[PDB]
């Protein structure tokens, strides 16, 4: 209503516009570095998960690892993966949930709080790495006793393209399941070492990465979209408040001027 009201509530939106715009380009560079980190993850999946495709490994209490991130301001990344885990957890209500990222721990803590036994923090700043992947995977084995569940499921977001993403699930098979797979014999594995045991702990770490890298790239492409739409909409308010200002500024001056003219007749 007043010039001061309009000057300070325009200014703040001029900032948000400049700001949300900066993080549209911030998370554009961050997309180039996370398309190469994605491809190197996805290419590596075909090579690792091919053995299982050929050995024909299938399943026979459940650990659910859910992956989004710590950050917000990224469309509906966290909201529609939590939506997936819920439709899944509806069928199997008796499962232990491990969360990677706070924005999915909260989404889930409000819906099935007691199923969550572990949370991973500080997760979506840089790209994901095998070190985070493996050290998350190591605690999984240690504190959750990962190696022992009949079924282990990673929930994550697959980048369909640049402009969208798909909430996806994948299984991890333990040592027992690998060994006792229909076409395991096709491969001449030396049964001395624990090739299945190692193959499991490696694939726990490895396919988590596969998931994190995609979810993360799904996110970086939801963030540069939500911010793209934010700048486009913040600029719409700057159009309203530029005009209202140019108005309220003139009105102020005219009304002080009427006061002055009245005071100057008498």
């Amino acid at each position: 209503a007043t010039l001061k009201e309009v000057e300070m509530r325009l200014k703040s939106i001029k900032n948000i516009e400049k700001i949300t715009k900066t993080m549209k380009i911030v998370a554009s560079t961050r997309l180039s570095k996370a398309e190469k980190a994605k491809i190197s993850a996805k290419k590596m999946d075909e090579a690792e998960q091919l053995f299982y495709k050929n050995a024909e490994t299938k399943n026979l209490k459940e650990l659910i690892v859910a992956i989004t991130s710590d950050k917000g301001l990224c469309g509906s990344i966290h909201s529609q993966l939590a939506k997936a885990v819920r439709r899944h957890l509806n069928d199997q209500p008796n499962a232990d949930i491990v969360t990677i990222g706070d924005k999915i721990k909260m989404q889930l803590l409000r819906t099935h709080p007691n199923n969550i036994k572990l949370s991973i923090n500080g997760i979506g700043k840089d790209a994901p790495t095998f070190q985070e992947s493996a050290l998350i995977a190591d605690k999984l084995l240690s504190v959750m006793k990962a190696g022992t569940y009949p079924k282990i499921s990673i929930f994550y977001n697959d980048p369909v393209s640049s402009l969208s993403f798909e909430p996806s699930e994948k299984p991890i098979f333990n040592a027992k399941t690998i060994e006792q797979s229909p076409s395991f014999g096709k491969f001449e594995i030396d049964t001395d070492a624990n090739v299945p045991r190692d193959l499991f702990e490696y694939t726990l770490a490895n396919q988590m990465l596969t998931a994190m890298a995609q979810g993360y790239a799904a996110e970086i492409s939801a963030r540069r979209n939500a911010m793209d739409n934010a700048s486009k909409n913040a600029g719409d308010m700057i159009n309203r408040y530029s005009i209202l200002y140019n108005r309220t500024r003139q009105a102020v001056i005219t009304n002080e001027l009427v006061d002055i003219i009245t005071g100057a007749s008498s």
Partner: protein, 49 residues
């Protein structure tokens, strides 16, 4: 110690002059990751990974 964590420590000798060591090598090496255990709302202290 576990086959993943075991190959990782091996991935940090081969990672740690500063030549054949681009920016993302010393960023493959750093983790801002803190694991919080949870029971019935939270339970115990958040520890470094």
């Amino acid at each position: 110690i576990s086959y993943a964590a075991y190959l990782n420590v091996a991935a940090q000798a081969i990672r740690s002059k500063t030549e054949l060591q681009t920016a993302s090598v010393l960023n493959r090496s750093q983790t801002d990751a803190f694991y919080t255990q949870y029971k019935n709302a939270s339970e115990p202290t958040p520890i470094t990974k």
